[PDB]
Amino acid sequence: FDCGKPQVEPKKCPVVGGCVAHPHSWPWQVSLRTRFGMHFCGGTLISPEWVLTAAHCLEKSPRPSSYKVILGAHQEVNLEPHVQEIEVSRLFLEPTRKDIALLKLSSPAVITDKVIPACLPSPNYVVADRTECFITGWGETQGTFGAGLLKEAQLPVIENKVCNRYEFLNGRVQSTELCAGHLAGGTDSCQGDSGGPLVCFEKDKYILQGVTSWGLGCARPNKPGVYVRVSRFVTWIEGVMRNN
Amino acid sequence: GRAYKSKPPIAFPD
């Protein structure tokens, strides 16, 4: 298998808003769960051993034995039979305290047609203004249907200088972050989607370009969602992977 | 106003 190439082609959707995904069309989507079985965040499988997520998802415990990753799932609760459920062995937080972290699985994930890593961007690459991307997760829906199933939403990327204007996020967004969403509102990632992916199609595969982090509410007008810019941490991520 | 999108979320006065 090749990274970022799903074995089920995802539906262009005509998480708040968006739609329920085709089962297993996003094979790198991870459900990060407490030791005692509660979904609380998302993550992205970037190789058989490594899960990329948000640092703040881990604040309630520094012990790896407190977390387990769920791979290949479509439902939040009553998981399918062939879902993979691997304990986390190590936790690595980015060393300048940005909102991204790495989990190391205790046994590598079996790569099947339902569990496939996503590709990493070239380091320090800037996703251009108005690039169409996708967000996925099991997060809050605010009555836009799809509760309890893996949802997706198609979002345009909004460049930082525009996103940082007073009428939008008014300076809050750092250069190691990116914004995405519809300025009209109605579509966003929401609570329960943190750590999950923002991927953008390039040539023939999806490239993980952001990690779901924060926002001023969800799906509000003039308030797009903010994501950690994954290309700014690629050299770090690779250094951790190659030494652990 | 900044709210991190975990469950449960973490919100700040900005």
Catalytic, A194? Answer yes
Domain that holds residue A219: 15-26+118-231
Contact B7 A192 (CB under 8 A): yes
Alpha-carbon gap, residue A225 to A182, rounded angstroms? 9
Task: Tell whether A144 and A113 lie within a shared domain.
Answer: no
The count of domains in chain A is 2
Q: What is the CA radius of gyration of chain A?
A: 16
- How many CB atoms neighbour CB A206 within 10 A? 22
Mutate to test the interface with B, among A191, A218, A226 (most CBs of B within 10 A): A191
- B3, B6, B14 member nearest A217 (Cβ): B3
Catalytic, A113? Answer no
- The label of the residue with tokens 């810019």 reads A229
Alpha-carbon gap, residue A140 to A151, rounded angstroms? 10
Alpha-carbon gap, residue A13 to A152, rounded angstroms? 8
Using the 8-state DSSP alphabet, how is residue A117 labeled? P
Task: Tell whether A86 and A144 lie within a shared domain.
Answer: no
State the method: X-ray
Task: Tell whether A215 and A124 lie within a shared domain.
Answer: yes
Contact B6 A57 (CB under 8 A): yes
Task: Tell whether A135 and A21 lie within a shared domain.
Answer: yes
Using the 8-state DSSP alphabet, how is residue A1 labeled? -
Alpha-carbon gap, residue A219 to A176, rounded angstroms? 22
List, in order, residues 6 or more apart from A67 with CB less than 8 Å away. A32, A33, A34, A35, A58, A61, A87, A88, A91, A103
Resolution in A: 2.3
A194 within 8 A of A24, measured Cβ to Cβ:
no
Catalytic, A2? Answer no
- The label of the residue with tokens 């046994």 reads A107
